[PDB]
Write a protein that binds this ligand. Structure first.
Ligand SMILES: N=C(N)NCCC[C@H](NC(=O)C[C@H](N)C(=O)O)C(=O)O
Ligand SMILES: N=C(N)NCCC[C@H](NC(=O)C[C@H](N)C(=O)O)C(=O)O
Ligand SMILES: N=C(N)NCCC[C@H](NC(=O)C[C@H](N)C(=O)O)C(=O)O
Ligand SMILES: N=C(N)NCCC[C@H](NC(=O)C[C@H](N)C(=O)O)C(=O)O
Ligand SMILES: [Mn+2]
Ligand SMILES: [Mn+2]
Ligand SMILES: [Mn+2]
Ligand SMILES: [Mn+2]
Ligand SMILES: [Zn+2]
Ligand SMILES: [Zn+2]
Ligand SMILES: [Zn+2]
Ligand SMILES: [Zn+2]
Lengths: 364, 365, 364, 370
């Protein structure tokens, strides 16, 4: 019913080897392929519990012989970060050994495949998809990473680059459910945004230092541009789901998110003999990431919020203040109209700390 | 208001920090109160409460209503306050020594009992002044070198001779609760009621010499060392956990500042103010040894089955540890009581304390 | 699995006979009893849409055979006000025929039952509850109202006085979600306030001219005082929910409010086999209604607000100004610290118009 | 600085005499003439506050001696409607005494002047303008209205018919800034539309029952047609500005609208020694009023919108539903491509309630005779 791989990473600075546990629910290399992972930031929990419950649903779908394609589930994509305790707190965002962000510095599969594809593309889009996916797998086989974190990033992209559907499950420090995707995959991924009840959908073609979701979807956009004489569709539809707050561990929520992910899999042809019915109403519009305001602390001090999580705020509104208990108070204003979909869990600032997010429409 | 900026020795980066101390009233006047917050630099509610208590005291000072000496330290630990790692503030342990900021305070009984051998009389007030003077002398003789030892030394040097000491703290996820010396209960019932404690935890001696016990324990221990002399519990100290570490709220901090102000009035620090009827205390004093620490026996997601503040019964499933790629382990209450604390970070390592139940029967654990 | 009653009011001044549509989802006269109504002020809409969607949820609960109690749903409790159009606007707050407020002059069930109860109470609280509820129904049966609005008020209290849970769904002209209840039912109704995300909870033992929620809950408090030798618990837990602004009709909001009401019904033992999970933390403290400041316009003119809805304001702050476009400007100040939970939808004043509300604590 | 008159209406049913306060910033019967009024519908507020701030700007222009013509400002053109409170709400759209709409049943100055002008027109357009304006004033002088609302309409047209520029400031129940003008006055009032940031410009030659803006501009079009052998230019350029939602009272917005109105006055030669500069971007095309779709509720119930104010919608899109909370749901579709520039503030319907507006380009079959 379910295959299990334990992929072993090379030893860290303490001589410790870690494993990535990967579950597969379908026929290997079959039909449509889905990839779902959680816990790439090891201190972001909601996705971990949601995929535990999605597995319970898929075990039943497997027993009933209703799995159509290949579904790949990784509830804890980052066993390195998961071990990084300091003074009794888990710091799962950055790699101790390299200092790098776990959701950065993924391979650029356009840069790795453009030369190889020069003579292989044709007028048949489906053919180009198979050629590009095969080329991507070959290009990754040629890379030889040495550090556990680079080997981990390599494995995760090697197992996801040829998928039709990729969902990277994340969380923010204090936030409402929200989604990120590639600009041209909107509104294609309207259904997934609606099912997971995103309260913000943030669009970009190219963001920061090569995150996982863009590593999966961007290559199809960049290859389409590299080879404009050939049909290259956006074959891999990836998104990042921030499912809630980092510490939001709740049975009801995880079960509801597992059921939503199951409904997404049904709608996209991974499950048969199950009815989905009407798509839920999406509570927000897609906006550009560059139109999103990061609220930053201009100084150190207590973070005092004047708005609740999810409040609509307008340009000029006082949203948060930094209070020095032995000094001055500094007021921070909204510079755009939008929804305060994120704040922060730790209510003390250092200068340039991002302490909140407003999803607006006008680029900043 | 007087302001002192006490300078700590430079750290490993050659950086010196200051402890900012505010004083209201005349030096050495009448009764003495000491209030500090942020000894654990990641525990915020007390920091904001003392900011607002200062606003109230500035007005009391303008109106010439301060009777004794009130010492306010909103951020008692500027070392911990600088300790950022991967964007998170880790303010509980000192990064040079690895020690807990609220442990390893001096034992002022051990430091004064020899000196006091020939100095005590049948006059209680005399003994209080002699013991306080001896404590100050004993501390003057100590020469700490590490910034954290210098910090602990300064904080006890400025508080040991106070009549009232309130150490303002927080827990990772908790209701307002209080700790004090067993024999100071019910003496400190009024302060517990004003701050709306939902648990009062009593001990004569706890862990490795925390600040509140460093202030009040010496009077109990000297009373026992010299049973032939009147030695009252002259320094009434308590720890207030004012809420969750990250519970920063205007309304709450203003309410806590007003409660602290009312405590100062009741205990004779503020003139020309009537307080009136004491609020109802929501809990009984219980022993710290009757408190259950809920521990994770294994790593995994922390799933709570009880809300913060629920009354739970022995045998109840209160919390589960869930391995998202493994097994689930259920954690049971071993005592009836109030779940006054849980935890903010919902993932465990083995032996992690993930919650606290205030019970009445002492536990053998 | 859902009953429908169409209760006929006597014909009005135009010879029009109107109906109150009542839906019942459970076991008649059994188990726990819940009563939910909306639209008593016929121009307050959010509750009307929320109960439409709560019915969809209860139809499914009924189909799944999960209803434990008797649940009474009245999405439009006031068909009189609902007809009162003038110049294309619906004026649903006052009765055209009598000039009276629709949420005033409800019967006092203490005054109506104290004589009857003198010899019927015992040391058994559950007995007293059944005796008092039976006595209330009898006392109301004996009343003979003639005006459609008196008949309407009579029916609504007759169907709610014996409930364990009563939620009267309202709105304000421009407001945040807020709640009113009987002072001694706080913090008993903390869970209710938390699920609906109230941003103010206003407490009173006795308010104005006998509103519906107090008509339901006050009698238990007043009978407890009338008969202090007997255990009389506050058997009917009533509250008023102002679910937002009068005109705040939104699909997402009404669905979210329907789901919150469903969660309240589950928590209070009306629905089987549903896991709810952790209670949301309440965003406000209970304050006294007597500590609330009404901001009044001292003169006619434009209402210019300086504070946004939901701002925390301090005594002395300029909150709103009245601007005469051909005359003078008058500044209106906060006289208490608290939350500006209400403003107004029509931004022009007449003298003594209430143009906003601040929920304070009445300190000294 | 400015002249101030208080024109007294005859006493109403309660024996109360109401007054219209009129401000004048220029000379008298001078140079170019501008007329700006707000609050004809007394429950439409944004224009009231905008003209308060425009007066502050004009007081300064007057102090600096920079007023070039006659500028007439009426922040509250309708003191009758302004008094009409019921159950704490202001109902300012219809006159209590007559039941008539405050922005309907204005005089037709073509019908009133065609006979008088028969022998008075010549080859000189400027002459014809002065003759027609004098004739209009005489024709109105001859009328004797009795009811307060008829006297009010009479005064407002008497003070505006001879203006070169007329801006009637209005609002809708829930709407984006939009404009109405006479079909042949477009492209010409492009500058006005651009300065106020209209999101729809709606054109008609004849709309409903004789509104104020058409009462001012239509006569020139109709007289041109009555006397085709003479040059009769569209001497009075009128427009209706719906400045926003009825209840949209905001300091920043009113100041921005006052500044835009000031820039319009500069561009059209009312303000001396001030340069405006480059014209702002026009956000929309001029479209016919008969190409505008009115969304109507076919039944009573909750108004549930599926589109935001200002969304672009396409023919076939579900825009709004009417939901009977104890009955059925009815879906309402867009039947044209365009911007949903208006919805409604009160989210409950009666049958045939207009619950929104879409500005399209293709004339719609049902939009005839308004
Ligand atoms: N493709 C993108 N544009 N974004 C990538 C997904 C966003 C994602 N964000 C977080 O993990 C939340 C984090 N606590 C925070 O502070 O934001 C990430 O950085 O991995
Ligand atoms: N034991 C005493 N007599 N004094 C009370 C000390 C308790 C106090 N606890 C805390 O700051 C909360 C901490 N997060 C925790 O997990 O306990 C402290 O360590 O200062
Ligand atoms: N006070 C109570 N006992 N509770 C009843 C809630 C009050 C309730 N208020 C409203 O519908 C809003 C109204 N615009 C206003 O200005 O209040 C009502 O009058 O029925
Ligand atoms: N076409 C013209 N000549 N004039 C158009 C003016 C329209 C203008 N309409 C309104 O105030 C808004 C109204 N709620 C509505 O539904 O339109 C008016 O009546 O004055
Ligand atoms: Mn502040
Ligand atoms: Mn469990
Ligand atoms: Mn003002
Ligand atoms: Mn609908
Ligand atoms: Zn992340
Ligand atoms: Zn602490
Ligand atoms: Zn109401
Ligand atoms: Zn109008």
């Amino acid at each position: 019913t379910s295959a299990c791989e334990n992929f072993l990473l090379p030893a860290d600075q303490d001589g410790i080897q870690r494993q990535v546990t990967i579950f597969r629910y379908g026929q290997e290399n079959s039909a449509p392929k889905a990839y779902l992972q959680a816990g790439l930031h090891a201190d972001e929990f909601p996705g971990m519990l949601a995929l535990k419950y999605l597995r319970d649903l898929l075990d039943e779908a497997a027993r009933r012989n209703r799995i159509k394609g290949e579904i790949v589930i990784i509830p804890q994509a980052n066993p390195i970060g998961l071990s990084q305790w300091k003074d009794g707190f888990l710091l799962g965002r950055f790699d101790h050994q390299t200092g790098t962000n776990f959701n950065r510095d993924y391979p650029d599969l356009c840069q790795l495949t453009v030369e190889k594809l020069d003579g292989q593309l044709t007028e048949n889009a489906e053919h180009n998809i198979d050629v590009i996916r095969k080329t991507m797998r070959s290009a990754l086989s040629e890379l030889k990473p040495e550090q556990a974190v680079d080997v981990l990033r390599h494995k995760l992209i090697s197992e996801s680059c040829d998928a039709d559907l990729v969902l990277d499950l994340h969380a923010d420090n204090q936030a409402q459910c929200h989604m990120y995707t590639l600009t041209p995959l909107w509104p294609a991924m309207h259904d997934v945004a609606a099912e997971i009840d995103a309260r913000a959908v943030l669009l970009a073609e190219e963001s920061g230092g090569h995150p996982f979701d863009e590593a999966c979807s961007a290559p199809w956009m960049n290859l389409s541009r590299a080879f404009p004489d050939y049909p290259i569709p956006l074959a891999c539809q990836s998104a990042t789901f921030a499912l809630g707050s980092n510490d939001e561990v709740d049975l009801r929520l995880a079960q509801d998110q597992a059921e939503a992910l199951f409904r997404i899999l049904i709608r996209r042809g991974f499950i048969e003999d199950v009815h989905v019915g009407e798509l839920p109403q999406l509570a927000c519009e897609g906006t550009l990431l560059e139109a999103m305001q990061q609220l930053k602390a201009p100084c150190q001090g207590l973070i005092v919020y004047h708005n609740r999580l999810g409040d609509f705020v307008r340009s000029g509104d006082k949203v948060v203040s930094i209070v020095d208990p032995i000094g001055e108070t500094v007021d921070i204003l909204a510079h755009t109209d939008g929804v305060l979909f994120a704040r922060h869990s730790q209510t003390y600032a250092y200068p340039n700390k991002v302490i909140g997010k407003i999803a607006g429409k006008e680029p900043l």
